[PDB]
Amino acid sequence: SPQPLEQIKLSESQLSGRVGMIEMDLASGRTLTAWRADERFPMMSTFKVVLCGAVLARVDAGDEQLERKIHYRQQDLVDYSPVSEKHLADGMTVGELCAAAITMSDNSAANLLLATVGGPAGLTAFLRQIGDNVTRLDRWETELNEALPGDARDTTTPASMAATLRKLLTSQRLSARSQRQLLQWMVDDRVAGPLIRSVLPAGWFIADKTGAGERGARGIVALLGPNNKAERIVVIYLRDTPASMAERNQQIAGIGAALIEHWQR
Ligand SMILES: OC[C@H]1O[C@H](O[C@H]2[C@H](O)[C@@H](O)[C@H](OCCCCCCC3CCCCC3)O[C@@H]2CO)[C@H](O)[C@@H](O)[C@@H]1O
Ligand SMILES: *C(=O)c1cc2ccccn2c1N[C@@H](C(=O)O)[C@](C)(COC(=O)Cc1ccccc1)S(=O)O
Numbered sequence: 001s002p003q004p005l006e007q008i009k010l011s012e013s014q015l016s017g018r019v020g021m022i023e024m025d026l027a028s029g030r031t032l033t034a035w036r037a038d039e040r041f042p043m044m045s046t047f048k049v050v051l052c053g054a055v056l057a058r059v060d061a062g063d064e065q066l067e068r069k070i071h072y073r074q075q076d077l078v079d080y081s082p083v084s085e086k087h088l089a090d091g092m093t094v095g096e097l098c099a100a101a102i103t104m105s106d107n108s109a110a111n112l113l114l115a116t117v118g119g120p121a122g123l124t125a126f127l128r129q130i131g132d133n134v135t136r137l138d139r140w141e142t143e144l145n146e147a148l149p150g151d152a153r154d155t156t157t158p159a160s161m162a163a164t165l166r167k168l169l170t171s172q173r174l175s176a177r178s179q180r181q182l183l184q185w186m187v188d189d190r191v192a193g194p195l196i197r198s199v200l201p202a203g204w205f206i207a208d209k210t211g212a213g214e215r216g217a218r219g220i221v222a223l224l225g226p227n228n229k230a231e232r233i234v235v236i237y238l239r240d241t242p243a244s245m246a247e248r249n250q251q252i253a254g255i256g257a258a259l260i261e262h263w264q265r
Helices: 004-015 044-061 094-104 109-116 120-131 158-170 176-187 192-198 243-262
Strands: 018-023 031-035 207-213 217-224 232-239
Touching: 004 031, 004 120, 018 044, 018 158, 018 207, 018 243, 031 158, 031 207, 031 243, 044 094, 044 109, 044 120, 044 176, 044 207, 044 217, 094 109, 109 120, 158 176, 158 217, 158 232, 176 207, 217 243, 232 243
Parallel strands: none
Antiparallel strands: 018 031, 018 232, 207 217, 217 232
């Protein structure tokens, strides 16, 4: 594999799309690789990690409990509810809803949680409160995946998302337990995580949330490192490519391979 930046360029050439990327030390925030780091990309499902950060902040404040059972109706369900559709009779706890949102990409779980934090406006306010002045959520699932060209709704920048993830995971804004919970939810991805492990060399740590959208939008927020440590945050977004999902996946994997082969920088 070539150097990370050279691979990123190749990916734009092959895909005819825009790639946005940040590689950042998790402990310190040192930026290692930055490409289109200040350009806007749709968050898609990656917003769910921020959402559950906001939920945990409420838990820490005594305004929420992870144990609290939420009951909902079939009419509340939106497209793709693999966990939440199974609990119309018995409900789900707030913590279970965050697990379903993050580890199973359950859209109804995400919307139920979004309601608890004051909707898209509330989550945007939370972002402003932790010092992210760029990322914005405007819509609910699944409209937030629309990825219209030039539409600022429901977008982040790679630099903003990386900084925000680091804030939630490490800055002591969240309690120790809450930081640990948010990390464990990302470790526990039931879909991409296990497949990624199968193709990672031995010794590489992975935790992640993936996302997809219209017009080729695709992305991942990940923790990655050798020696079985979450050494770095890697944020990669793609937009405005006509390519197959398989090729978008391949290109993101290729950027990963470049990082792995050229890790010491
Ligand atoms: O010399 C370094 C390594 O080179 C190869 O490893 C390959 C591996 O066989 C391949 O499967 C992976 O693809 C990358 C797949 C990563 C999956 C997605 C990555 C995630 C991580 C967070 C951001 C991007 C998405 O690349 C590495 C590096 O070339 C060798 O197989 C391995 O023995 C050796 O230790
Ligand atoms: C966010 O999670 C999201 C947004 C969105 C829009 C349309 C369709 C699906 N979708 C998701 N979730 C999927 C995603 O692609 O991120 C999931 C998690 C499917 O995941 C994968 O396909 C990742 C993967 C790639 C290659 C190999 C193995 C796994 S969801 O549909 O289960």
